[PDB]
Amino acid sequence: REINFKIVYYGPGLSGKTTNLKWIYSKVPEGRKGEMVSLATEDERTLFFDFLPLDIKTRFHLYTVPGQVFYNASRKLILRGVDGIVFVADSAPNRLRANAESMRNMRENLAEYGLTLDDVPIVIQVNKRDLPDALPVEMVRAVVDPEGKFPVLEAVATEGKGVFETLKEVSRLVLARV
């Protein structure tokens, strides 16, 4: 009947993690989706997580994690059992370091589960390519994936650009392991 998979969206505050789910939700037909759930603060910064369940019998559970540094304890929990990860990096000059800290943070959290960055498929999304001062892609990429060992996709998640292909690619990788 049905295999279940968990996908997590990771990355620094404001990089667009929640926006990816909002897009995806707005374009998947009713019949291939359940309702989206968000536990967010008053300023729509995610506090616990987002959750969106979907069809592609293979069921994908997508989650977002809160990116702000001081929400680490909830971030940890949301990675439990993860099967595939989308790391959404920010394109803004002033957020490059935020990117790297979040990546170092993701290795630290996985290591508490006994997992390395080799153990879970990971897809890098460089989001926010519309910004006037957008850093070159390979610079942002060099910071997060110094060895180029992870697929890269460019995105403007506020407009849909890259949202689904990023999703397809992490999907592709998770199935290729099963």
């Binding site: 968990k6 359940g34 309702e35 616990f48 997580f49 559970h61 439990r80």
Partner: protein, 133 residues
């Protein structure tokens, strides 16, 4: 993961229907700690339930967060949880290390029987879950 197919699944469903009979509860679920609905049953008499997937992520994450707090207080675990409104309530308990028993109930169901059979049901499902890991 946790492959719940075949004879385990049928046993699991049997424990859930029996639990609804004995307790007067509206909805019974077996979920995993990741959030995945593994088996569920509704009291025939009961209205349509709220979206079961929403309910299951919320309960997984509530179990995960309270278990994180037990851990940071030096404790292996807290006790089973009952959440109680003016009319509606939830009973959540451990179905072994990988799963949760959820029961949703209302003002018609005697809380005492919820806990007593809630507990019995949890232990029965632990037993089925261990045979299917």
């Amino acid at each position: 993961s946790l492959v719940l197919y075949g004879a385990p699944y049928a046993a699991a469903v049997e424990v859930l229907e029996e639990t609804l009979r004995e307790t007067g509860a509206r909805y019974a679920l077996l979920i995993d700690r990741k959030g995945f609905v593994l088996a569920h049953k509704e009291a025939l008499w009961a209205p349509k339930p709220p979206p079961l997937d929403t309910l299951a992520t919320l309960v997984a994450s509530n179990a995960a967060a309270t278990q994180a707090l037990a851990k940071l207080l030096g404790e292996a675990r807290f006790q089973e949880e009952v959440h109680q409104g003016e009319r509606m309530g939830l009973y959540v308990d451990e179905a072994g290390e990988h799963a949760l028993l959820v029961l949703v109930f209302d003002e018609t169901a005697p809380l005492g029987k919820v806990k007593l059979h809630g507990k019995a049901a949890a232990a029965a499902l632990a037993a089925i879950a261990e045979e299917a890991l």
